[PDB]
């Protein structure tokens, strides 16, 4: 199972929820919600929407296809690495928000 | 095979002969039972034939 990213809302896409669209150029687009799908159908610019994460990132308000053999030790190490990375990212986001507020 | 293949196979179940003998002995009883149980136009046709 892979959690796709929304094309408009730039958010995670879970099975059963959201809408998947395929273009003529073999392009796959995911909408996090009905409003995001409606905005995509209305040709709304992702960077021109306040609630969209794309605009938040590019406005100063925010900061593997190669097969690999399975390894239990690597997976166990990656389990703690993901938590450490998330904690570091949360701390960095909090620092960025504090700097932006000031 | 070809042509009368079924006839050729016959030329080339044995219990049917025993079954036929049993049916032949029961034929006398079967004819009486069928005639007595027949109803409608079929009963009249069977009686006329007999």
């Amino acid at each position: 199972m892979r959690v796709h990213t929304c094309y408009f809302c730039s958010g995670p896409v879970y099975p059963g929820h959201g809408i998947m669209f395929v273009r003529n150029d073999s392009k796959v687009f995911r909408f996090c919600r009905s409003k995001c799908h409606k905005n995509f159908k209305m040709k709304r610019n992702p960077r021109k929407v306040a609630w969209t994460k794309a605009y938040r990132k590019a406005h100063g308000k925010e900061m593997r296809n190669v097969p690999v053999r399975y390894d239990r030790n690597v997976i166990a190490t990656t389990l703690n690495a993901m938590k450490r990375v998330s904690q570091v990212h949360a701390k960095r986001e909090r620092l960025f928000y504090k700097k932006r507020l000031a | 095979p070809q042509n009368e293949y079924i006839e050729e196979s016959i030329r080339k179940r044995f219990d049917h002969e025993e079954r036929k003998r049993k049916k032949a002995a029961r034929e006398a009883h079967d004819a009486s039972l069928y005639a007595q149980k027949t109803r409608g136009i079929k009963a009249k046709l069977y009686q006329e034939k007999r």
Binding site: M1, R2, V3, P12, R64, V68, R69, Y70, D71, R72, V74, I75, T78, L79, M82, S86 | -
Partner: protein, 37 residues
Amino acid sequence: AGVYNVELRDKYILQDPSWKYDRMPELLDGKNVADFV
């Protein structure tokens, strides 16, 4: 036919037989673990 259970893990070239018979994480905390490992 139609009731026989066929397991794809048996036809594996994994070094560890236990690892081949054991599933791996796919998605965790909203992130695709299988696609990010």
